Amino acid sequence: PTEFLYTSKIAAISWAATGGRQQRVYFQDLNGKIREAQRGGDNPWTGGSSQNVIGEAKLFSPLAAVTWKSAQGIQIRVYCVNKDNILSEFVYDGSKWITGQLGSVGVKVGSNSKLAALQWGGSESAPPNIRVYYQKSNGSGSSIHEYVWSGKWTAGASFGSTVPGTGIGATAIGPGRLRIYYQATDNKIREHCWDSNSWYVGGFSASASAGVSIAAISWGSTPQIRVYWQKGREELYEAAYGGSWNTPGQIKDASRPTPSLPDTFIAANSSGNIDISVFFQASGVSLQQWQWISGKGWSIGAVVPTGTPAGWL
Amino acid sequence: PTEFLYTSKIAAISWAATGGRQQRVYFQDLNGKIREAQRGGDNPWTGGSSQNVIGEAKLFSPLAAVTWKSAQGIQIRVYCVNKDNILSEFVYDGSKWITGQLGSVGVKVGSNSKLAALQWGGSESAPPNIRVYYQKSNGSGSSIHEYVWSGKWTAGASFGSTVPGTGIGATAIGPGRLRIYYQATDNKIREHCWDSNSWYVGGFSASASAGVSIAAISWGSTPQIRVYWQKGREELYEAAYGGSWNTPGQIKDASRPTPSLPDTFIAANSSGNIDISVFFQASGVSLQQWQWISGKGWSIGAVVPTGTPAGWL
Numbered sequence: 202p203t204e205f206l207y208t209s210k211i212a213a214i215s216w217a218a219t220g221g222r223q224q225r226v227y228f229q230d231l232n233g234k235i236r237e238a239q240r241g242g243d244n245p246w247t248g249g250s251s252q253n254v255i256g257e258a259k260l261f262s263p264l265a266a267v268t269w270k271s272a273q274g275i276q277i278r279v280y281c282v283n284k285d286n287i288l289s290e291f292v293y294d295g296s297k298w299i300t301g302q303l304g305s306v307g308v309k310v311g312s313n314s315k316l317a318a319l320q321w322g323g324s325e326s327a328p329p330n331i332r333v334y335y336q337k338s339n340g341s342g343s344s345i346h347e348y349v350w351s352g353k354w355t356a357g358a359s360f361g362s363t364v365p366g367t368g369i370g371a372t373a374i375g376p377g378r379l380r381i382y383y384q385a386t387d388n389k390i391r392e393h394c395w396d397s398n399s400w401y402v403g404g405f406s407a408s409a410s411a412g413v414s415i416a417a418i419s420w421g422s423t424p425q426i427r428v429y430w431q432k433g434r435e436e437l438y439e440a441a442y443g444g445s446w447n448t449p450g451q452i453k454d455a456s457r458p459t460p461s462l463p464d465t466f467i468a469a470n471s472s473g474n475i476d477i478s479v480f481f482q483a484s485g486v487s488l489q490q491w492q493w494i495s496g497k498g499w500s501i502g503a504v505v506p507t508g509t510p511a512g513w514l
Numbered sequence: 515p516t517e518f519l520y521t522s523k524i525a526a527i528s529w530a531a532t533g534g535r536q537q538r539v540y541f542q543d544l545n546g547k548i549r550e551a552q553r554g555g556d557n558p559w560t561g562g563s564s565q566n567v568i569g570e571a572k573l574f575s576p577l578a579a580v581t582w583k584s585a586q587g588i589q590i591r592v593y594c595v596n597k598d599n600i601l602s603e604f605v606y607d608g609s610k611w612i613t614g615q616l617g618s619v620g621v622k623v624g625s626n627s628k629l630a631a632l633q634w635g636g637s638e639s640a641p642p643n644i645r646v647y648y649q650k651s652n653g654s655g656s657s658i659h660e661y662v663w664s665g666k667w668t669a670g671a672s673f674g675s676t677v678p679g680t681g682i683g684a685t686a687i688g689p690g691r692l693r694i695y696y697q698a699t700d701n702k703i704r705e706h707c708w709d710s711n712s713w714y715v716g717g718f719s720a721s722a723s724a725g726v727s728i729a730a731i732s733w734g735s736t737p738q739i740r741v742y743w744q745k746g747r748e749e750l751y752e753a754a755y756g757g758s759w760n761t762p763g764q765i766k767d768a769s770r771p772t773p774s775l776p777d778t779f780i781a782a783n784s785s786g787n788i789d790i791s792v793f794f795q796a797s798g799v800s801l802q803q804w805q806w807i808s809g810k811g812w813s814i815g816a817v818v819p820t821g822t823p824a825g826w827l
């Protein structure tokens with residue numbers, strides 16, 4: 202066994218690095234702490250133990266994360282909710298983990314809400330712009346709400362009418378250009394868009410099983426967008442945009458059918474042009490991922506460590 | 515969500531009572547504590563919360579339990595293992611829960627061992643006789659070992675050659691008459707027997723999926739024996755002895771196929787003539803049971819409460 206909480210949410214980030222791409226993945230342990238595992242290049246994953254705690258949250262808290270590089274080092278923000286269902290944030294400030302300012306705002310989250318986050322613009326010569334997406338209510342038809350950091354936290358938009366506790370994918374497809382994916386009450390995944398000065402309904406839609414976990418990434422100049430969804434113990438789906446949307450397809454391995462456990466979640470990261478990881482939870486209880494390689498395709502990669510309880514090896 | 519640890523082992527007991535049969539079920543929470551839930555007659559289940567802790571054990575500890583009535587009240591013994599893989603015992607002494615004497619003996623248990631226990635003879639006019647079954651080693655071909663209480667703890671028999679971490683069912687089919695069920699290295703469930711002065715190989719056998727969780731009960735004068743086995747997310751099987759063994763059959767509900775989660779465990783209790791519960795773990799994460807009623811048959815009964823984490827209703 203491991204210390205990975207069954208039906209923990211997952212969050213993941215990636216960035217380019219001299220010597221190999223850096224990845225971090227966040228998950229919850231049996232004690233409610235949020236742990237980090239790390240990967241550099243194709244070296245074995247590290248971390249995931251009781252010595253890798255970065256924060257804590259209510260048991261079964263939703264999670265989301267973003268990163269950028271600043272003059273102070275690598276910045277990471279991990280979003281979660283506390284035991285009072287208040288939206289909360291852990292900060293890696295370039296050198297240490299601390300509690301961030303978002304928790305003091307008092308944003309109430311529905312108990313079954315998921316979280317998504319995106320960021321654009323942050324660098325060693327420009328400030329970050331963060332957007333966090335959440336729900337206030339658990340019921341069918343609830344909207345998605347946005348909290349905004351472009352110098353200070355303030356409320357943003359609300360939109361959509363969703364399945365209860367919908368999955369939410371969020372990606373900045375270009376500077377100040379946002380795409381948000383969620384599952385509407387007809388079980389179709391839908392898209393909401395911001396290009397300049399307003400939100401509008403996007404052209405993407407796809408039928409999916411009720412209650413799928415959703416993630417989204419993007420890169421490049423077209424731009425390229427990939428939207429992932431998965432119901433636990435069903436195969437992963439991807440929809441791809443390269444100027445138009447393709448027909449969604451399954452990412453699967455005939456020797457390892459439907460490798461996730463029931464009622465589990467996914468997360469995706471990306472960096473470069475292009476490296477992609479899609480994390481899932483499997484028997485073990487293990488943290489697994491799909492990986493994309495151009496000219497090999499998709500495969501299940503190395504297992505991410507998630508601790509070993511006392512009394513076991 | 516609940517506080518029921520996913521892939522927790524389960525133990526259960528039952529006894530006849532004026533006003534309705536009493537049941538207790540034991541399971542592990544996310545903190546490693548062993549909790550109790552209670553039922554009287556067909557009234558709703560109670561307990562299962564953080565206020566119902568009876569002991570603690572290593573995370574994912576095996577569990578077993580027995581009960582009898584004494585001059586001091588209802589006696590319960592719950593077997594588990596600590597963080598050093600030492601066989602341990604919690605005692606309900608008729609009025610309170612305390613730590614029992616078995617832990618001080620120093621019986622090492624294989625980290626992946628299951629536990630079973632049986633009892634006969636204990637009453638308000640006779641002392642109890644307890645037997646606890648465990649494994650020392652995790653590997654294929656390991657034996658089952660027995661620890662014995664008939665006034666003080668001492669080692670008993672060892673027998674069998676099993677699948678790694680085999681399920682173990684144990685029942686006293688009559689006074690000092692024992693039947694032990696386990697899965698041998700050919701994946702057949704096999705039977706070991708004690709009637710008077712020696713162990714011998716029994717006539718029961720049945721093919722089963724590798725790694726099934728096993729439970730066994732018995733009652734009456736024939737006697738009647740029932741052996742249960744289940745692999746997580748497969749249907750429950752029962753083999754029945756009433757003088758001869760029947761062909762094993764599935765206990766299932768066409769509207770709720772394979773209702774347990776992968777890699778989960780079962781436990782059975784019985785009392786009277788006859789009331790039977792077979793507990794399993796399902797999405798929720800929930801503690802469920804099959805129940806037998808003469809002239810209705812088998813059905814899935816009321817859900818057993820297993821707590822609600824803070825931040826959820």
Ligand SMILES: CO[C@@H]1O[C@@H](C)[C@@H](O)[C@@H](O)[C@@H]1O
Binds near residue numbers: 239275277293
């Ligand atoms: C150098 O430190 C490593 O990388 C940082 C960006 C953080 O992810 C930190 O938790 C990790 O230990």
Ligand SMILES: CO[C@@H]1O[C@@H](C)[C@@H](O)[C@@H](O)[C@@H]1O
Binds near residue numbers: 290
């Ligand atoms: C400087 O403040 C830190 O970084 C900002 C970009 C926000 O993530 C804020 O909540 C956090 O406390």
Ligand SMILES: CO[C@@H]1O[C@@H](C)[C@@H](O)[C@@H](O)[C@@H]1O
Binds near residue numbers: 347356
């Ligand atoms: C300028 O407007 C703010 O930033 C945009 C990119 C959107 O996140 C919008 O909902 C928010 O109010």
Ligand SMILES: CO[C@@H]1O[C@@H](C)[C@@H](O)[C@@H](O)[C@@H]1O
Binds near residue numbers: 392403424
């Ligand atoms: C112009 O079209 C809009 O932007 C594209 C990048 C896609 O997100 C598409 O689904 C959306 O309707």
Ligand SMILES: CO[C@@H]1O[C@@H](C)[C@@H](O)[C@@H](O)[C@@H]1O
Binds near residue numbers: 439475493
């Ligand atoms: C070139 O292939 C396309 O882009 C890759 C980065 C993957 O998203 C793949 O599933 C998709 O078909």
Ligand SMILES: CO[C@@H]1O[C@@H](C)[C@@H](O)[C@@H](O)[C@@H]1O
Binds near residue numbers: 538588590606
């Ligand atoms: C009266 O007390 C109830 O029954 C006893 C036999 C024990 O199961 C105890 O934990 C429970 O609360």
Ligand SMILES: CO[C@@H]1O[C@@H](C)[C@@H](O)[C@@H](O)[C@@H]1O
Binds near residue numbers: 616
């Ligand atoms: C009196 O001693 C108690 O009851 C016996 C029957 C045993 O269960 C023993 O380990 C326990 O401490």
Ligand SMILES: CO[C@@H]1O[C@@H](C)[C@@H](O)[C@@H](O)[C@@H]1O
Binds near residue numbers: 645660662670690
């Ligand atoms: C008398 O022998 C003891 O009791 C029997 C009923 C068996 O449990 C045996 O293995 C044990 O040594």
Ligand SMILES: CO[C@@H]1O[C@@H](C)[C@@H](O)[C@@H](O)[C@@H]1O
Binds near residue numbers: 705715716755
């Ligand atoms: C006499 O036969 C023995 O006892 C019966 C009660 C059964 O346990 C049977 O499988 C075993 O071989």
Ligand SMILES: CO[C@@H]1O[C@@H](C)[C@@H](O)[C@@H](O)[C@@H]1O
Binds near residue numbers: 740752754788806
């Ligand atoms: C009378 O029916 C037999 O005994 C019952 C108590 C159950 O064990 C049932 O599955 C079995 O077929």
